C-alpha cells in the first residue's frame, strides 16, 4: 500500500470501502477496495484477474498484506446511480438506456459463459465513462440494499443460478425507464411482498417447486399480477416483453443474457454519448 495514495472515498459496499487512489509507480488513477480480514478466497479472486471484457471493470491487482485484502480496479468517472440521479428531471434518453442494457447483457453473457456470477448487481456497481460504455464491477463469491434481489434468494435457495443477475438487471432496466426503483423493499419480507404485489404471488403453476422452497410460507397473501403496461410506461412492447422475460419467477424460465441479446428490442440499438457532469 506504500505505492498507493488515497484521493477520496467513492463507495462503501458490503465487503469493504472503495477509494479513488493514485498508483505512485505508474501515475495511474485506480479504484482501491479494502477488505478487512481465507486462502480459497485469495485464489478465486485471483482467477477474476483473467476475466477481461469491454463491459467488465478491469481487476488490475489483488494484494494480500497485513490482515487485509486490497482489490485494485481500473477507475471510471461515474456510477449509474449518480447518472440516474443527474437525469431525474429529464430521464435517460431511451437510445442510451437500450445501449446500456445491451452492453450489460454482453458483460453478463461473458461472465456467465465462464460460470462467474455477480450476485449483487445494483446501480452503484455499474460504472460509466464519457464514451458511452458501461461496465459491471466487483463480482461476488458464493445498510444492505435488497431492491434488486431475485425472489429465489429471498425464498432461501442457497444453490441459485446465473438467472439471479438477469433479475437484478431487469429491475435496473425498469428503474432507468421510470426513474423510480421497481421494488424498493426495506426488509426481506417487504421486498418479497412488493414483488408479489406487482407480479402476483407465485404458485406451482408459474413456478414449479416454489411451495417447497425453504422460506416459502403457505400463509403468504395471494395477490393478483399487474399488467406491465402500468408498471413501466412509456416502454414499448419489445421492451416490456423483454423485461417480463427477465422477471419470470422460475429461474429456469427467466431469459438468459445470450438469448436477451437476440431480443427484437435491440434491433435498433446504437451507442450514444452520455451528457456527463464530472
Ligand atoms: C461500489 C463500487 N465498487 C467499485 C469497485 C467501484 C468503482 C470501480 C471503478 N471506478 C469507480 N468509480 C466511481 C464510482 C463511484 C463514484 N461516485 C462517487 C459517484 C465515482 N465518481 O467519481 O463520482 C467514481 N468505482 S464503485
Q: Are residues 248 and 211 in the same domain?
A: yes
**Cβ contact 31:25 at 8 Å:** no
Helices (H), ranges, the chain: 39-47, 80-86, 94-113, 151-154, 163-178, 188-199, 228-231, 237-246, 257-261
Neighbours of 162 (CB within 10 A): 20
Q: Are residues 4 and 135 in the same domain?
A: no
* Residue 10 Cα to ligand 1 middle (Å): 5
Q: Do both 270 and 181 map to the same domain? A: yes
Nearest atom (ligand 1) to Cα of 82: 19
Q: Per-residue b/e over 7-46, b at no fewer than 16 CB within 10 Å? A: eeebbebebbebbbbbbeeeeeebbbbbbeeeeeeeeebe
Q: Which atom of ligand 1 is nearest to the CA of 13?
A: 1
In angstroms, rounded to a whole number, what is the distance separating the alpha carbons of residues 223 and 100? Answer: 33
Q: Which residue in 85, 120, 165, 250 is the catalytic one?
A: 120
- Whole-angstrom Cα distance, residue 160 to residue 108? 16
- Dihedral in degrees, nearest 10, Cα atoms 93, 146, 76, 42: -150
Q: What are phi and psi of 20, to 5 degrees?
A: -80, 135
At which residue does the C-alpha cell 408498471 appear?
231
**Is 138 labelled a binding residue?**
yes
List beta partners, residue 45.
none
Ligand 1: residue of 69, 85, 127 to mutate (most ligand atoms within 8 A of CB) is: 127
Experimental method: X-ray
Q: Look up cell 411482498; give the residue.
A: 193
Q: Is 78 helix (H, G, I), strand (E, B) or coil?
A: strand
Given the DSSP bridges, would you call strands 4-12 and 29-36 parallel, antiparallel or unpaired? unpaired
Phi, psi angles (nearest 5°) of residue 253: -90, -20
Q: How many Å apart are CA 110 and CA 153, to the nearest integer?
A: 22
Decide: helix, strand or coil at residue 212: helix
Give the range of the structural domain holding residue 182, as residue numbers without chain letter.
Answer: 78-276
- CATH code of the domain containing 269: 1.10.510.10
Q: Which of 50, 77, 104 corresponds to the end of one domain?
A: 77
* Residue 189 exposure: Cα atoms within 13 Å on the Cβ side: 6
Q: Which of 49, 77, 105 is the last residue in one of the domains?
A: 77
Asked whether 23 and 4 are in contact (CB, 8 A), the reply is: yes
- Residues 24 and 111 placed together within one structural domain of the fold: no
Question: Are 52 and 88 in a shared domain?
Answer: no
Same domain, 122 and 258: yes
CA 130 to chain centre: 20
φ, ψ at 7 (rounded to 5°): -105, -55
**Residues 220, 196: contact at Cβ < 8 Å?**
yes
Cα dihedral value 194, 200, 206, 208, nearest 10: 50
Active site residue 120: yes
* Distance (Å) of CA 134 to CA 104, 105, 185, 274: 7, 11, 26, 11
* Count of structural domains, the chain: 2
Helix axes of 163-178 and 94-113: crossing angle, nearest 10 degrees:
170
> Are residues 131 and 245 located together in one domain of the fold?
yes
Pocket residue to mutate for ligand 1, from 18, 56, 83, most atoms within 8 A of Cβ: 18
**Residues 186, 49 share a domain:** no
Q: What is the CA radius of gyration of the chain?
A: 19
Q: Which residue owns the Cα nearest ligand 1 atom 18?
A: 10
Count Cβ neighbours within 10 Å for each residue of 53-65 and write b for 16 or more, e otherwise. Answer: bebbbbbbebebe
Distance between CA atoms of residues 34 and 37, nearest Å = 9
> DSSP letter string over 146-192?
-TT--HHHHTT-SS--THHHHHHHHHHHHHHHHSS-SS--SSHHHHH
d(CA 264, CA 266): 5
Instruction: Residue 261: count other Cβ atoms within 10 Å of its Cβ.
Output: 15
Q: What grid cell was written down for 177? A: 425507464
Q: Name the DSSP class of 77.
A: S
**Calpha distance 84→196 (Å, rounded):** 26
- Asked if the bond preceding 3 is cis, omega within 30° of 0, the reply is no
CA of 65 to the centre of ligand 1 (A): 23
Q: Kindly report the CATH number assigned to the domain that includes residue 30.
A: 3.30.200.20
Same domain? 11 vs 29: yes
- CB atoms closer than 10 angstroms to residue 270: 10
Looking at 77, 100, 133, which one is the last position of a domain?
77
Q: How far is the CA of 214 from the centre of ligand 1 (A)?
A: 36
Task: Let me know: does 254 contact 194? Beta carbons within 8 Å.
Answer: no
Same domain, 55 and 131: no
Resolution of the PDB structure in angstroms: 1.8
Do 25 and 89 fall into the same domain?
no
Pocket of ligand 1 (CB under 6 A): 10-11, 13, 18, 31, 33, 57, 73, 75-79, 82, 124-125, 127, 137-138
Cα(81) to centroid(ligand 1), Å: 10
97 a known binding residue?
Answer: no
Same domain? For 16 and 137 the reply is no
Amino acid at each position: 500500500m506504500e505505492n498507493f495514495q488515497k484521493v477520496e472515498k467513492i463507495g462503501e459496499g458490503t465487503y469493504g470501502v472503495v477509494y479513488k487512489a493514485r498508483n505512485k509507480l505508474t501515475g495511474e488513477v485506480v479504484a482501491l477496495k479494502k477488505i478487512r480480514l481465507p486462502s480459497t478466497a485469495i485464489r478465486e479472486i485471483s482467477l477474476l484477474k483473467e476475466l477481461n471484457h469491454p463491459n467488465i471493470v478491469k481487476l488490475l491487482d489483488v494484494i494480500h498484506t497485513e490482515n487485509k485484502l486490497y482489490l485494485v480496479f481500473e477507475f471510471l468517472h461515474q456510477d449509474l446511480k449518480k447518472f440516474m440521479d443527474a437525469s431525474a428531471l429529464t430521464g435517460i434518453p431511451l437510445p442510451l438506456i437500450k445501449s446500456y442494457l445491451f452492453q450489460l447483457l454482453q458483460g453478463l453473457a461473458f461472465c456467465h459463459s465462464h460460470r462467474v456470477l455477480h450476485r449483487d448487481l445494483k446501480p452503484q456497481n455499474l460504472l460509466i465513462n464519457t464514451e458511452g460504455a458501461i461496465k459491471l464491477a466487483d463480482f461476488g463469491l458464493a445498510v444492505v440494499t435488497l431492491w434488486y434481489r431475485a425472489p429465489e434468494i429471498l425464498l432461501g435457495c442457497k444453490y441459485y443460478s446465473t438467472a439471479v443477475d438477469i433479475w437484478s438487471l431487469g429491475c435496473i432496466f425498469a428503474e432507468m425507464v421510470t426513474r423510480r426503483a421497481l421494488f424498493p423493499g426495506d426488509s426481506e419480507i417487504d421486498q418479497l411482498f412488493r414483488i408479489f404485489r406487482t407480479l402476483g404471488t407465485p404458485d406451482e403453476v408459474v413456478w414449479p417447486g416454489v411451495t417447497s422452497m425453504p422460506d416459502y410460507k403457505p400463509s403468504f397473501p395471494k395477490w393478483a399480477r399487474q399488467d406491465f403496461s402500468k408498471v413501466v410506461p412509456p416502454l414499448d412492447e419489445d421492451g416490456r416483453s423483454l423485461l417480463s422475460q427477465m422477471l419470470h419467477y422460475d429461474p429456469n424460465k427467466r431469459i438468459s443474457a445470450k438469448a436477451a441479446l437476440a431480443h427484437p428490442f435491440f434491433q435498433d440499438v446504437t451507442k450514444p454519448v452520455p451528457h456527463l457532469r464530472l
